[PDB]
């Protein structure tokens, strides 16, 4: 059970900053009205293999609370493209290796939190 947490609404240029609690990998997606969900960060168990999305490179950062059995995605330099669904997934299927960019690969998730860049 994924218990999401933080999105909301920031100016374009901004930060906001997504959590989500539940061994297994972590990813966020995203889904805008009228498109295909989307890929946007993954992070293994131990915290030391990350994988972002093209999108997502040079300006957001995922982590891992390994104390709190936490997940979190800290995005900056948002634009109103950014503007989505985000949901975080859980994928028991990898132990060790970070999460992989395929939704189908993930079991677990999040109930999803609005993020909006004005």
Same mark, same amino acid.
């Given at each position: 059970?994924?218990?999401?947490?933080? =999105? /909301?609404?920031? +100016? $374009?240029?901004?930060?906001?900053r997504l959590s989500?609690?539940?061994?297994? #990998?972590?990813?966020?997606?995203?889904?805008?009205?009228?498109?295909?969900?989307?890929?946007?960060?993954? *992070?293994?168990?131990?915290?030391?293999? %990350?994988?972002? $999305?093209?999108? $997502?490179?040079?300006?957001? %950062? *995922?982590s891992? !609370?390994? #104390?709190? &059995?936490t997940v979190s995605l800290q995005? !900056? &330099?948002? &634009?109103?493209? !950014?503007? #989505?669904?985000?949901?975080?997934? #859980?994928?028991?299927?990898?132990?060790? /290796?970070? =999460?992989? +960019?395929?939704?189908?690969?993930?079991?677990?998730? =999040?109930?999803?939190? +609005?993020?909006?860049?004005?």
């Open positions: 059970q994924l218990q999401e947490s933080g =999105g /909301g609404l920031v +100016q $374009a240029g901004g930060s906001l989500c609690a539940a061994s297994f #990998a972590m990813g966020w997606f995203r889904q805008a009205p009228g498109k295909e969900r989307e890929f946007v960060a993954s *992070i293994s168990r131990s915290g030391t293999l %990350t994988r972002y $999305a093209d999108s $997502a490179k040079g300006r957001f %950062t *995922i891992v !609370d390994n #104390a709190k &059995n995005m !900056d &330099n948002l &634009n109103p493209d !950014d503007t #989505a669904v985000y949901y975080c997934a #859980a994928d028991l299927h990898r132990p060790y /290796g970070p =999460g992989t +960019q395929r939704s189908d690969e993930y079991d677990s998730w =999040g109930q999803g939190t +609005q993020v909006t860049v004005s």
